[PDB]
Amino acid sequence: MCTRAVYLGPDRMVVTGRTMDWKEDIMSNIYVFPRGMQRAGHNKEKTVNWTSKYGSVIATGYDIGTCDGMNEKGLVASLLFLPESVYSLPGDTRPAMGISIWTQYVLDNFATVREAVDEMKKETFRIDAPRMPNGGPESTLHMAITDETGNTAVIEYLDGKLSIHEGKEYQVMTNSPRYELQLAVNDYWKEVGGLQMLPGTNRSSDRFVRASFYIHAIPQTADAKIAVPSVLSVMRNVSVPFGINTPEKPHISSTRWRSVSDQKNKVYYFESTLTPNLFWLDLKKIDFSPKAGVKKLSLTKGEIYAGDAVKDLKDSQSFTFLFETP
Amino acid sequence: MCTRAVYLGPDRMVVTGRTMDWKEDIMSNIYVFPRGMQRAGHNKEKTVNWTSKYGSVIATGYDIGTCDGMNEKGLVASLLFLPESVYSLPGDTRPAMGISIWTQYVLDNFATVREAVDEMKKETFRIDAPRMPNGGPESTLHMAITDETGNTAVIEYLDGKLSIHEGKEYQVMTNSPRYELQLAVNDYWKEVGGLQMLPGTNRSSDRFVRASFYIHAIPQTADAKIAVPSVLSVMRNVSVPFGINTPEKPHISSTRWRSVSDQKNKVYYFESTLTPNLFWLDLKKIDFSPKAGVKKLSLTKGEIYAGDAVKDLKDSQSFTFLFETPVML
Amino acid sequence: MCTRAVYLGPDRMVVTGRTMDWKEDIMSNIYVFPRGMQRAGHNKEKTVNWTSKYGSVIATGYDIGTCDGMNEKGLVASLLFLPESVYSLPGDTRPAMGISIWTQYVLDNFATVREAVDEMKKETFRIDAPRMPNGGPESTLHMAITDETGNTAVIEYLDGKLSIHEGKEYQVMTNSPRYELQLAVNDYWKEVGGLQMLPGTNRSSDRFVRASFYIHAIPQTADAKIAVPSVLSVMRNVSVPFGINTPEKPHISSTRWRSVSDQKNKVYYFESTLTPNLFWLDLKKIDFSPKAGVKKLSLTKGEIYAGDAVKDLKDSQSFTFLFETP
Amino acid sequence: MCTRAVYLGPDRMVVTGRTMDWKEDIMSNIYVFPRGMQRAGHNKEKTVNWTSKYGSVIATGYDIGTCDGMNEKGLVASLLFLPESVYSLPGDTRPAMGISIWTQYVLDNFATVREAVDEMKKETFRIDAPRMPNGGPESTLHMAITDETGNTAVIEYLDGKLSIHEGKEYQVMTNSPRYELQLAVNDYWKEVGGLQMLPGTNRSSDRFVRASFYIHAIPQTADAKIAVPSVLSVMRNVSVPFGINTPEKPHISSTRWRSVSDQKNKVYYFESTLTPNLFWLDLKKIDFSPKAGVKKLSLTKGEIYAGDAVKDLKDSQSFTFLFETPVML
């Protein structure tokens, strides 16, 4: 289960925040992909192709598939799990894309939430991955994106049929249930106020109401030196302890890492639970030229970065997305 | 306001943490006090003196009085808030140890909760509480002491009469009401189970229940690299958001920093709500010799640190405790 | 705000329960209407007409409009307030019916939930009443009906467009919000269980979850001597104290009366808060012949009935429904 | 289990009600006892005797011992449950008044809480608790007494030591834990406000909070016709559903009947969960003369009544209290 929230500050101040929780280690890493690069939405299926128009920084999943990142044009994307997401019924002859690269496609071809919604509602392809290949627990997610202007759009495939809700009023997103209900739930908690009562359980829906109430009670300021820690605080509030385990639940999904993107100033921020220090990357201080080279920022070996870990950027081989089932 | 809890792990692993919530800036700092330092419990009233037994690292608040820290013997003490507090009735005439140095006196002259339990129950000195009318809240608090053995003790002068609670079970504590109630109220939610319901509200009791439930659920492991993060994680959870304001409730005490101690290894980790990195100080690499010098680690000007901030210490003169209500801002 | 719940007992055991709460006195009464009677869906508007096919007993509203009742064929109807119910936008040339008689129409022309749904989805008319005529607080409701078989159908007009949900799994109904959300809310409370935690507030949505969990934990028995009090208990649980008043809320809507219908055995049950005793009426012990006469069962003057208040039935003039705005 | 609360209205209006929840049938009944009836606090142990001062209407449980009632002086007493109860420590040798007649002895020999407060604090007699191993829960309860003046008192033998709480504020009481905690826990929800949140759960504390909040919100009126229904309304609210069963929690104590008293007018209203009408008995129309005769109003066979059930009383012999653990069913 994961959550993501977006802050709408004065003077185009847009800062997004995404959570990462998983049962075991995620082995995620940060890769930087300049523009002018082509990719295939799938390797063993009929698929579409494109050409990376913008550079961006994203967080990987075991070095297999992107699930969060921010592009040059202050636009951030995030994939959160949704236990009731189906992408297509039989009879789909469209170019089958794979859920592993769904994220990467959008960031490489979009810079404004408006434009992204347009091409998506064409359903020009079906994006899928086989079920429980590695005996995994679940394998179904939904994505959220936001531009440096403050507009956001939640996307979910309802048993094959896409389901999208666009607008700036929608700035938080958890796992389950369906958003229309996920939001309807909050209607009840808002009347009971947040101060006089606030549910502290860890269920997917519970994490939603908390973020909603706090992300508004936060100070309405356009400055960037303060909003960043403010966004992370609620991320820490919504974040859950690591290594939890009760008699009923033998193993649990713990808070592994979180991400925040200063979409107004184009600065991505990333933190790991088992790390003491906080680092960041300034996209404006990054050469996304067509021929700049792929520099990786590894985190598996437990490296400890901090500050502007741009000097620590090392040229590395872009992780190969996985559409097979092994 | 704040919230404190203690973790009890195998292999003598006992990690304690603390939270700090304030409506404005605390302007806290950090100072070092080698052993063998005489001190007076007050500058103008009849109070005892002493010479620091064990060197102690303490975190200051406004550079007037220590609010939390440690000493040379895995003895971590913290001072939280409590409105319904009364230290003495009209007529008390004992030595009135100012509240500003009460904690420091403890860390200085104690290394085990059992000892402090004794010297405390002697009821030798009163507690001096200054009163101020211009934007100042009267001093009404309580304290908690934990030993590297894992034994904890709660102290609170309830309506002029002090009540102490010792034991290893007693590991969590928050603002109000009195622990006699807070502990029992929590037992209610215990029935409900944390997985199913938990008062996520920022209120005192709400935080107490959440900390109590999670502190057990966290991993019980003897390794420090794992238990420490598992601790601060609940610290951030119990910690309320930063700078919350509502039209009805305009100002609210917001979190300003968190403190964690590895009493099993004598380490102190510190982070601020406005400081991204997490620095620490290895007490073992310290020298508390009587003539080692008072060392300060300023933070008023917003200095930034990370890792082990041993090299970045600068000797300075001891701060000045506050025993009498300030005349004005 | 009002609530209604339906019990599905073994061997076609169907018993419905409806709540009544209002700010001040309701001045309601119980009228019996045999079959073979004609009515007009509105007096000053183009309207449809029919001929009462079955007899039934209903509870009136100030002696102006029916809001609850049970027919011969063990089918019960109930109108509950819904603050977000609109019945038609401009351009409605259909026979305008009035919200006051909407209830009476269904009971007089239906005996099975299936048949009722059919004719309703024709939208052959618009049923409306002018807004705040007597300075009233609100004036928008939704209806729930159930046959002696156990099938129920909730109905709500979404800004003119009807909204219906049919099935036996839907046996409880409160005021707000919309049902699709009103039910989605319960999804959260069911996971938290009812025993280990149950919200006791009085808001419309809160009253829903309580009834849902209890109406299932109740014993699954086909006997009728016990299920009746069981249904009323939750009605008492969902029922709220009378004359409540805090500093914030100066006057409140108190629990005035409740109703339960033994749809399997065709027996209607009614209780008033300010009355000590409980009475009932056995439809099977009632002559709904075309020419039987209208016998009223008054309750305004605070009469105190009990037991089988059929002997207390007195021939009276059927209350005239109100479509005007005075 | 059960739950009790007291309403305080102007013009000396004080209406008290009670709830009864049991896993099976209580087989309760009703009996009348005119004044001037000698009684012994036990049949086989050393116990005091007495002669009933004030006639008292009591509701029996299994026709063995009174669980609630009243006397000739607007003095309504009730007996609720409490697991963590201890009446005396090993070695007590005082008069051991059986728990079955403790209540009756009170109503018989008292007319004001102040008096009972005195005679009770004398600590003259112990409490006899029988122990049974076959489907029987050991007797562990507490009591509450209210006077027509509106003053209430809570009594509970906590770990062999009795603790009393008197006053007009103390009007609500439930199962567990001890009122010292139950009262304070409720103060928590008080913060949350009843309109915004209320633990609708059937648990002991949940019911206590709901009753406390609503009992104030109900109409404060001097007329009986209005206050009485406003009372029983909260009684039904606090009352848990009937015959609840879950696969995990199979059997649960369900509500069986509710009792209300108009202490200002000396009336007793009674209803059963399986009885639709609400009958009552006007104590004023009663004769408790010493030789008036013990009168019973049976309910085992499920008789049905309504209105004022004065005419439908049938004289019978007094029931038999239980002082010793029954040999078997």
Ligand SMILES: *[C@@]([C])(=O)[C][C][C]([C])[C]([C])[C@@]1([C])[C][C][C]2[C]([C]([O])[C][C]3[C][C]([O])[C][C][C@@]32[C])[C]1[C]
């Ligand atoms: C959140 C919680 O905000 C995003 C979570 C995403 C990154 C993960 C849930 C995801 C998609 C990553 C990869 C794994 C997914 C499934 O659990 C199936 C596999 C499980 C295996 O343990 C690792 C690789 C898979 C593909 C997983 C939910």
Ligand SMILES: *[C@@]([C])(=O)[C][C][C]([C])[C]([C])[C@@]1([C])[C][C][C]2[C]([C]([O])[C][C]3[C][C]([O])[C][C][C@@]32[C])[C]1[C]
């Ligand atoms: C429930 C709560 O289950 C059914 C409630 C129905 C019977 C009432 C809400 C209703 C329709 C009855 C009549 C009155 C309605 C409005 O409040 C507008 C008027 C108010 C006035 O005080 C009495 C007559 C009106 C038509 C009312 C909601």
